Design a protein around this ligand. Sequence first.
Ligand SMILES: Cc1cc2nc3c(=O)[nH]c(=O)nc-3n(C[C@H](O)[C@H](O)[C@H](O)COP(=O)(O)O)c2cc1C
Ligand SMILES: [Cl-]
Ligand SMILES: [Cl-]
Ligand SMILES: [Mg+2]
Ligand SMILES: [Mg+2]
Ligand SMILES: [Mg+2]
Length: 206
Amino acid sequence: TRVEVQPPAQWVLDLIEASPIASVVSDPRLADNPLIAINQAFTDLTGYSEEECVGRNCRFLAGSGTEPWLTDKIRQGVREHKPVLVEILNYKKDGTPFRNAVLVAPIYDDDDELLYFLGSQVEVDDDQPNMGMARRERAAEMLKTLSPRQLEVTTLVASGLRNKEVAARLGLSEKTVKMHRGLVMEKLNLKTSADLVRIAVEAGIA
Ligand SMILES: Cc1cc2nc3c(=O)[nH]c(=O)nc-3n(C[C@H](O)[C@H](O)[C@H](O)COP(=O)(O)O)c2cc1C
Ligand SMILES: [Cl-]
Ligand SMILES: [Cl-]
Ligand SMILES: [Mg+2]
Ligand SMILES: [Mg+2]
Ligand SMILES: [Mg+2]
């Protein structure tokens, strides 16, 4: 099955379009928390077009060998509004199995009002199946270059707090939080918020 989805708003596109990583957004108020947008990298990773994905829950990538003890951790993150990174067996449109390092994280619309989920998928090769640990090592090194306030804002954003919540936690304005976020993105060459949440969760700071 599949539901018809409203074209994505600009903030949805801003979350994923410039990520070099397969990135998606879902809307949990729609039937079966379906995908409402995918980037180009997601089509290149999986072979599915945007028309084939949007309106469906992302578990269409699952197949015979997919680990329910790992997908349950995603289910838990979605229910608790917390980020989860697991490495699960998935299947491309042509039936090619691949190990998917998938991040599912809470994210907010550009008014900091309603909750959505972002998804970030990286292929782990059968060749180099410990690639996950190499991405963790890189992430940890990058985050150690951040100033203390930048690290604090990064941690709380990646933990799933909206900017208004980060602002309340640190005694700042939303504007000041958005400024610190932008400087982290510029310093670490991160294209989108999905890319920022991913290095935070890879490192284990969220
Ligand atoms: C934004 C987002 C991205 C997701 N990406 C994937 C993915 O790449 N592969 C996949 O198998 N599951 C993915 N999922 C997980 C499924 O949608 C689902 O949450 C998970 O399998 C647990 O739910 P279930 O027990 O009903 O399957 C994603 C979920 C969301 C919300
Ligand atoms: Cl879901
Ligand atoms: Cl301030
Ligand atoms: Mg596109
Ligand atoms: Mg299941
Ligand atoms: Mg709005």
